[PDB]
Amino acid sequence: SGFRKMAFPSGKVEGCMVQVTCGTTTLNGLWLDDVVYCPRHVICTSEDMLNPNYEDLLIRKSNHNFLVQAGNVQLRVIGHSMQNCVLKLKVDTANPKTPKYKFVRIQPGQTFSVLACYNGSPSGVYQCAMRPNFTIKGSFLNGSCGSVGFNIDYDCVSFCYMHHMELPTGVHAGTDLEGNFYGPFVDRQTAQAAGTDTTITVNVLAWLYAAVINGDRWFLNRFTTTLNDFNLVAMKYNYEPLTQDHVDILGPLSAQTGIAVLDMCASLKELLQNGMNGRTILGSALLEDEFTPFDVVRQCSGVT
Amino acid sequence: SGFRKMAFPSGKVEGCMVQVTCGTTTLNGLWLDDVVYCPRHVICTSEDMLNPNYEDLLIRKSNHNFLVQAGNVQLRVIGHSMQNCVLKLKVDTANPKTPKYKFVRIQPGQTFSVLACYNGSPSGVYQCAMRPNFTIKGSFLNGSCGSVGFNIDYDCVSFCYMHHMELPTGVHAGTDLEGNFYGPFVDRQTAQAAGTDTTITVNVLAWLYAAVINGDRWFLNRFTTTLNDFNLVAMKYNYEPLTQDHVDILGPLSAQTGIAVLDMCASLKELLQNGMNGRTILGSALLEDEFTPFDVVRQCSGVT
Ligand SMILES: O=C(Nc1cccnc1)N(CCC1CCCCC1)c1cccc(Cl)c1
Ligand SMILES: O=C(Nc1cccnc1)N(CCC1CCCCC1)c1cccc(Cl)c1
């Protein structure tokens, strides 16, 4: 029993963190096989970031300008290429600690763990959600660029995020491991609008199921609702509209608890319209949307 | 910017997790050097747990009865000894992945990361606080016993907790790495009272400083208070009384932000007496007490 914002064990990802220095700029890199992945802005100075011409900036750089340090040992760079907003530095040595991995582009609403790094050294690990507006509410300071987001299915690490930028609003923006930004963001020191964000409805419902499993039941009621009725309330409170796909993915939790999905929606409708009335659900005084239905099942069953 | 409930990177601790089986009972072990540490209740069956005579139960066991599996390889047990509520199994091989480590008994109010494990396999990592009543609000299921709590200063892992028991109230109880329980708990299937818990005042104040640093300032006011006045309010709202030692440890944050400790106490007094009025602080709709002053400084500065 109990329910926590659980991160994946960071071990397999720690063994891939390296420091990348190009000129005066230092950030984090991801060493998988004989390739080091890092944000392309490693080739910039603070001055260049206003409107960098990355093609031109990269042209003035050679393999020997990219200093890659794995803990304390130097890696020999034999190739360099820019793919979208990432630099791929071919090294002469394959990382002996490379785990089984995939590069995946996660969907908005999906969660992942972040291993925050500075100078190729890990500082901490936390569990995040990719917001519906493609930003993340991380904890990142200067030098955190290159820190990655990931998920782990048994021995396979699926890399999904690489940290690039902090928007002037304090939220974070980054790319998949092919350098494609999540959202409309560009790697430039300019004010960039993150779209209107919404609450991930399916995740809140999953977290309401986790609360039922762990004892918190005060929010349960004698009501039911329809997808149409629930969606009118979801619209009013800036919640993602619930679809049959979300209901279908909530199947396992509905079956384990015996609480129909639309009955749980009715509880969420009352919590939305009336608040928590000074009460808490799983230690939180608000509706938590950073646990997917899969995260709840994994944590409640003990999937290692 | 941003502020998250950050766990330490779990890598150094993952390399020490083993599975321990004695008869029909399987739990987690901690392999450091040539010793495997696990909860002594590994020698019990469900039936024995009502009032186990561990001395007698251990007497019926030999080195060959303790099956220790590190991932997939078997460890040869050459010795066994009970120290308080832990079993120390001497193995013939030193763990090649043993990091620099210490065994420390943490104080109530201090925080640590937990690497939740099942069958010697890690499932996740979360950041916890040792409650003032010596319980932890973890996420642990059957088989999680043996999962450890720890802190990391550069390359040294300080082990502070080992999971043993879930109280009938859903909270968790365990020992330091010498087998001494935190709190009045005994490793027996009996209803055991966890004392009246309080909120860790110094940690809430540290988290109020973290909010100021990260932009959340709405709670700041034109008021100040005294330690005496603040403590009358702390008493009324079940908060640990604030002492000069707590004020002294808040020094760094007070100096970085320019907000005197007693001024921040005055903000906490108004939040206690008036609530949050439908507002949030660092994404939380309640007063967070699971970040110590040191955790806030570490996260805000980027200590790896
Ligand atoms: O956001 C950034 N950093 C940051 C700070 C806090 C948290 N998360 C990240 N940067 C700064 C990167 C530059 C620093 C000076 C040397 C050249 C690299 C940034 C600025 C604009 C666009 C991009 Cl893509 C990145
Ligand atoms: O709390 C326990 N487990 C648990 C479950 C969920 C979360 N955290 C832990 N146990 C169960 C251990 C017994 C299970 C059957 C075989 C013999 C070992 C326990 C029961 C009484 C006292 C003690 Cl010390 C431990």
From Swiss-Prot, chains A, B:
Activity regulation summary: Inhibited by pyridone-containing alpha-ketoamides compounds 13a and 13b. In turn, alpha-ketoamide 13b (tert-butyl (1-((S)-1-(((S)-4-(benzylamino)-3,4-dioxo-1-((S)-2-oxopyrrolidin-3-yl)butan-2-yl)amino)-3-cyclopropyl-1-oxopropan-2-yl)-2-oxo-1,2-dihydropyridin-3-yl)carbamate) inhibits SARS-CoV-2 replication in human lung cells. Inhibited ex vivo by michael acceptor inhibitor N3. Inhibited ex vivo by compound 11a and 11b.
Impact when changing residue 132 to H: In strain: Omicron/BA.1, Omicron/BA.2, Omicron/BA.2.12.1, Omicron/BA.2.75, Omicron/BA.4, Omicron/BA.5, Omicron/BQ.1.1, Omicron/XBB.1.5, Omicron/EG.5.1
Result after altering residue 142 to A: Does not affect ability to cleave and inactivate human TRMT1
Result of changing residue 145 to A: Complete loss of 3C-like proteinase nsp5 cleavage
Peptidase C30 domain: residues covered: 1-304
Catalytic reactions of this protein: TSAVLQ-|-SGFRK-NH2 and SGVTFQ-|-GKFKK the two peptides corresponding to the two self-cleavage sites of the SARS 3C-like proteinase are the two most reactive peptide substrates. The enzyme exhibits a strong preference for substrates containing Gln at P1 position and Leu at P2 position
Cellular compartments annotated: Host cytoplasm; Host Golgi apparatus; Host nucleus
Catalytic machinery residues: 41 (for 3cl-pro activity), 145 (nucleophile)
Domain of life where this protein originates: Viruses
Cytoplasmic domain ranges by topology: 1-304
UniProt cross-link Glycyl lysine isopeptide (Lys-Gly) (interchain with G-Cter in ubiquitin), position: 5, 90
UniProt-reported outcome of changing residue 205 to V: In strain: Zeta/P.2
Self-association state and partner proteins as the record states: 3CL-PRO exists as monomer and homodimer. Only the homodimer shows catalytic activity. Interacts with host FBXO22; this interaction promotes the proteasomal degradation of nsp5.
Function, in words: Cleaves the C-terminus of replicase polyprotein at 11 sites. Recognizes substrates containing the core sequence [ILMVF]-Q-|-[SGACN]. Cleaves and inactivates human TRMT1, preventing tRNA guanine(26)-dimethylation of tRNAs. May cleave human NLRP1 in lung epithelial cells, thereby activating the NLRP1 inflammasome pathway. May cleave human GSDMD, triggering alternative GSDME-mediated epithelial cell death upon activation of the NLRP1 inflammasome, which may enhance the release interleukins 1B, 6, 16 and 18. Also able to bind an ADP-ribose-1''-phosphate (ADRP).
Protein name per the record: 3C-like proteinase nsp5
Organism encoding this protein: Severe acute respiratory syndrome coronavirus 2
Full-protein interval shown: 3264 to 3567 of 7096
